[PDB]
Every structure is written in C-alpha cells, then in structure tokens.
Design a protein around this ligand. Structure first.
Ligand SMILES: C[N+](C)(C)C[C@H](O)CC(=O)O
Length: 280
C-alpha cells in the first residue's frame, strides 16, 4: 500500500565503471541525508541496454549514469545528433514519450570514447587526430573494452567503415585495463573513456575525432515517472546534483578510486563532505 512507500528501499543501478559506482553511491547518500528512505546499489550492470531493461521491469528505481549518445542510437534507434544540447533535448522528449522515464539534465560532464596514445608517441609522430593514425594503423596494436567489437552504431564495425582503417591488432579487455596497457607500451593506442582519472597522470594524449564519428555523451540520471510520483521528495534531491560536476572533477573522483585505491562509497562521501552536500 501507499503508506508503505516511505518504508521501501530505492534501488540505484550502477554500470561496471568506477564512475557509475561513485555517482550511484553519491545519489544514495544524498537521498539518505534528506529523507528516511533506504537506498541500495545494484552493481555490475553490463551496459546501457541492461540499465534500460532494468528500469522498465522494476529491477532498478534509478539509473545513476546514462549517456545521451548511447541511448539515442542504442535505445531509441534514432539518427545521431552532433549537437550536445539538441541530443539531450531529443533524448529527454523521447524517453518521456516512449517509456514514461525522466531523463534528467546532465550532472555536468560528458564521458566519450576517445582514441588515446602516449604523449611520447604523439610527440614523435605528430599525432593530433584520429585520421593522423590512418597511415600507421597496420603497425598499431589497439586495446579496446570488452563490448566495443560487437557494439552497433558507434562500435568497431562502423568505425572501420567511417574512418577507412583497420588496426594491425585489436585487443579487447576490461576497460579499466587499457590505461596501463598503453602506458606500459603493450598497446600503441587504446579506446579510452574521456573521464578516466588516469589519462592525465599517465601522460596520455586523447586524439581529436576529426570525422565526428562519436556522438555527444553527456551523463544524467534516469528515473521512472512512477517512482517520482510515489516518492515526491526524490525530484528535489536529484536536482541538487545537476549541473554541478564538471569533467575535470569527474576525472579527479575516478582517480580516487582507480589511482588512489579508495572505495567508491568513500570517494562519494568525501566529495559530499567537501562540498557540504551541495548546499553550503
Ligand atoms: C561512457 N561511454 C559512452 C564511453 C560508454 C557507455 O557507457 C557504454 C554503455 O553505457 O553501454
């Protein structure tokens, strides 16, 4: 019954990325700061599609981190849109219309796929753009995440068709491993995620996507309208995180987990404390 709503546990989904665990924990702690609601994190969701299904079948009440470009092509099956603001607006409109899901404004950061090399290699061969490695592709070993080879739309197949290059070797691995793979020289180039905290201190260089192959990937929480109706305090709490977390900050938080060996819940807690829970 409705009088039991206050007694329910809010299930917050996290994908298998440090970023998603940090943000899921932050949102849970913020909810507990303001309400008597219990929260839990449903971790290790594999992908955008897994999160989408889990929202529609009640397995998660909030998806902590979704990315506009991924949802536009993968979930909505729409033509890609190059403009970040337009992509977000389209995604918001269609998510409400098709799924009765609220796709919130962004936290303030985007997390894009980015072809990444050591600064040493970039300096030696004057590498600035993806096209700059076209003539080198057969002599390069590329490390990628464990999903990108089969991924539709902005995956390996469409990349080869759009950029007209294939690498001498492709090596799928868990995303977290690619940073050490390129730093150590095992890979010459990797498809990194732009918010990773290791890119800066590992001395890595992200190449410009000069063909604009990759869409915008602004990050937002997504919540079913039914959940918002049953817990009317959630709207105001989620709003407190929006537009407040920039890409440099997200990278720093990711670094705390991956480079400074902190648990995502501790990273989230320390950030909330530093910023006085977003109201000083
Ligand atoms: C963040 N980004 C866009 C690099 C990868 C996506 O999260 C992949 C996914 O969510 O399925």
């Amino acid at each position: 019954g409705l009088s039991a709503a206050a007694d329910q546990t809010i299930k917050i989904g996290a994908q298998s990325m440090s970023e998603s665990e940090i943000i899921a924990s932050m949102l849970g702690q913020l909810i507990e700061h303001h309400t008597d609601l219990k929260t839990t994190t449903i971790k290790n969701l594999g992908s955008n599609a897994v999160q989408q299904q889990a929202l529609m079948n009640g397995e998660i009440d909030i998806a902590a981190t979704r990315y506009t470009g991924t949802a536009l092509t993968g979930t909505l099956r729409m033509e890609p849109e190059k403009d970040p603001d337009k992509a977000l607006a389209l995604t918001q409109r269609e998510f409400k219309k098709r799924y009765d899901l609220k796709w919130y404004d962004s936290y303030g950061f985007d997390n894009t796929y980015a072809f990444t090399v050591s600064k040493e290699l970039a300096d030696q061969y004057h590498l600035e753009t993806v096209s700059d490695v076209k003539k080198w592709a057969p002599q390069l070993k590329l490390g990628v995440d464990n999903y990108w080879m089969k991924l539709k739309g902005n995956g390996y197949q469409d990349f080869t068709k759009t950029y007209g290059m294939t690498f001498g070797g492709t090596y799928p691995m868990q995303i977290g491993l690619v940073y050490d793979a390129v730093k150590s020289g095992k890979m010459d180039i990797v498809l990194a995620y732009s918010t990773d905290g290791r890119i800066k201190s590992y001395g890595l260089k992200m190449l410009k996507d000069d063909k604009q192959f990759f869409p915008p990937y602004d990050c937002s929480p997504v919540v079913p309208e039914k959940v918002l109706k049953e817990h009317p305090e959630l709207e105001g709490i989620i709003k407190k995180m929006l537009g407040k977390i920039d890409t440099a900050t997200m990278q720093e938080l990711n670094y705390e987990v991956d480079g400074n060996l902190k648990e995502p819940s501790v990273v989230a807690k320390e950030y909330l404390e530093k910023h006085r829970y977003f109201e000083s």
